[PDB]
């Protein structure tokens, strides 16, 4: 992968996919720690606090030999806010990288703009490179191979389907998509995946290699009665199908105990990979 940035897959292609992938693999089948990263900094630029993200890249960083400082964003009021480029202008003076979490896509985008090191989108409300990326080594670990897996999502149309269905196409996926009207993703990422869309959840799952899913965003609750992926759905899957869900779960809704702790899941696997994909973006980007 070459761009300076990893806001989403955008100029990606399948051999910098797998590169990362194959990177991702073996610094977990190593239990990598090392001190590539040795005194370097990645700042973590949160709008929104998420304790899980924020686990994720100080661990990596700490695998890797450098650091990952916080930084509260939200501590700031919209009264004293610095235009994105005073932002970037700033830090990029003290820090080699940049990962942050924020509510528009839009501000991440304006941050990769004007800093001059790497930024990491760590979750925006239009894509989740860093969780797909945990998602494909899972296929992988699970399956020995990505091309022509057959992926159910089955829920919302949010940022992770949209990041899983960029990838889709670069690895070979067969995506199927359920969600209740309204909350389709936009039509072009599904085209260019080639994706299956569907209303209904039991034609999405049916024969497929993994069912996907994860929190939904009285009325949106109404709106996604019978998407819940429980025992009873996971059953519509091939035998050797698998359960992923982003966590954390939202239990009686989108799915259930037995679902995330069943013999279907691989759950905490997928979240497990989460560290080893972001120790190879951040190796990658920050080296
Ligand atoms: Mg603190
Ligand atoms: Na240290």
């Given at each position: 992968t070459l761009p300076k940035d990893l806001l989403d897959f955008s100029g990606y292609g399948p051999k910098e996919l797998q590169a990362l992938l194959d990177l991702a693999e073996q610094?977990?089948?190593?239990?990598?720690?090392?001190?590539?990263?040795?005194?370097?900094?990645?700042?973590?630029?949160?709008?929104?606090?998420?304790?899980?993200?924020?686990?994720?890249?100080?661990?990596?960083?700490?695998?890797?030999?450098?650091?990952?400082?916080?930084?509260?964003?939200?501590?700031?009021?919209?009264?004293?806010?610095?235009?994105?480029?005073?932002?970037?202008?700033?830090?990029?003076?003290?820090?080699?990288?940049?990962?942050?979490?924020?509510?528009?896509?839009?501000?991440?985008?304006?941050l990769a703009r004007h800093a001059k090191v790497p930024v990491v989108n760590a979750l925006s409300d239009r894509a989740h490179p860093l969780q797909a990326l945990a998602d494909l080594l899972t296929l992988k670990e699970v399956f020995g191979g990505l091309a022509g897996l057959e992926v159910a999502w089955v829920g919302d149309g949010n940022n992770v389907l949209n990041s899983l269905l960029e990838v889709a196409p670069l690895a070979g996926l067969k995506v199927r998509v359920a969600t209740p009207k309204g909350y389709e993703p936009d039509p072009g990422l599904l085209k260019r995946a080639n994706a299956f869309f569907t209303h209904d959840p039991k034609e999405a799952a049916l024969g497929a290699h993994a069912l996907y899913t994860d929190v939904w965003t009285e009325k949106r609750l109404r709106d996604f009665q019978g998407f819940q992926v429980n025992g009873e759905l996971l059953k519509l899957l091939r035998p050797e199908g698998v359960f992923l869900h982003c966590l954390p779960a939202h239990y009686g809704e989108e799915t259930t105990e037995e679902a995330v702790h069943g013999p279907r899941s691989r759950v905490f696997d997928q979240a497990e990979n989460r560290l080893h994909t972001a120790k190879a973006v951040l190796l990658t980007l920050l080296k």
């Open positions: 610094l977990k089948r190593e239990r990598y720690r090392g001190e590539d990263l040795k005194g370097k900094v990645l700042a973590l630029l949160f709008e929104k606090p998420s304790l899980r993200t924020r686990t994720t890249l100080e661990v990596a960083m700490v695998h890797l030999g450098g650091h990952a400082v916080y930084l509260d964003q939200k501590q700031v009021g919209i009264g004293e806010r610095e235009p994105v480029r005073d932002v970037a202008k700033n830090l990029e003076r003290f820090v080699e990288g940049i990962a942050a979490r924020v509510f528009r896509h839009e501000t991440v985008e304006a």
